[PDB]
Structure formats: C-alpha cells, structure tokens
Design a protein around this ligand. Sequence first.
Ligand SMILES: COc1cccc(CN2C[C@@H](C(N)=O)CCC2=O)c1
Ligand SMILES: [Zn+2]
Length: 139
Amino acid sequence: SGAIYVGNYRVVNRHLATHNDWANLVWEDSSRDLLVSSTTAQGCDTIARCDCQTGVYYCSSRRKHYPVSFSKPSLIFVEASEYYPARYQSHLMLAVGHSEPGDCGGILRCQHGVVGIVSTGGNGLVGFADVRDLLWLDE
Ligand SMILES: COc1cccc(CN2C[C@@H](C(N)=O)CCC2=O)c1
Ligand SMILES: [Zn+2]
C-alpha cells in the first residue's frame, strides 16, 4: 500500500484504489496501473520533473529504503495476476531489487522529488509506475 499526496490530488495504484478513490475519481489508466482521486486537504509531496535514472524506493516487505538504477518509462509485458490479465503495462520503469505484491504503493524518489510508485515485481526485480509526465498534478 501507499499513495502520493500533491495539491488537491491523491495518486494510488489503480488495483488498490478504494471506494472513496473511485467516488472522487479525476483520472485512471488501467494500462499504467494508476488512479488519481481528489482530496479536500492539501498534499504533502512534490513531483520530480526530470530524466533521473537513479533514486531510492521504500520496500515495506523489508521496512527499508533501497537505492536503485532504473530504466526509462516504457511498455513492458506483465504476467497475469489476481488484478489484471496478462498485458503490456505502459510508463513502467524496471530495476533490480526486492519487491513482493504488498509492496505496491511504495514511493520512488530522486533529488528532485517523487518519481513514481511500486507497481510490479518478483524474481529480484521491482517495477515503478512513472508519474513525472503528469504535469497537471502541479496545478
Ligand atoms: C511489487 O509488486 C509485485 C510483486 C510481485 C508480483 C506482483 C504482481 N502484481 C502486478 C501488478 C500490476 N501492475 O499488474 C498488479 C498486482 C500484482 O500483484 C506485483
Ligand atoms: Zn530527478
């Protein structure tokens, strides 16, 4: 679990969104595993607007943060799960690191701010859903 709070928005993994997120829906994209809902309280986070390929992410299954080198946002094949059929997930960035299903929502940050959230994993890999292209989050 985990979310990004920026301005009047809350960003979560689409497969983990609550009834409240869907009742206050702003935007969702099943192909990115992202959903954005509106909030009344002002958000605590800043979004990175950069091309960084190194950063640090929170791994809840280890209660630790890990430094990672990650690929550029791209279309990657993701195996079927209880939440989606087998499909290509877009705007996904891969890195070597520990991740288990419950780790989705952990934030990945660089020196400029929030880069994305954990969305995929297994086999010593961790995938992050990028949010840096969502410029409207800042307004
Ligand atoms: C860290 O996330 C992991 C780790 C191992 C396995 C998985 C598998 N999986 C893929 C997610 C997707 N973005 O399609 C949906 C939910 C899910 O359990 C995730
Ligand atoms: Zn950066």
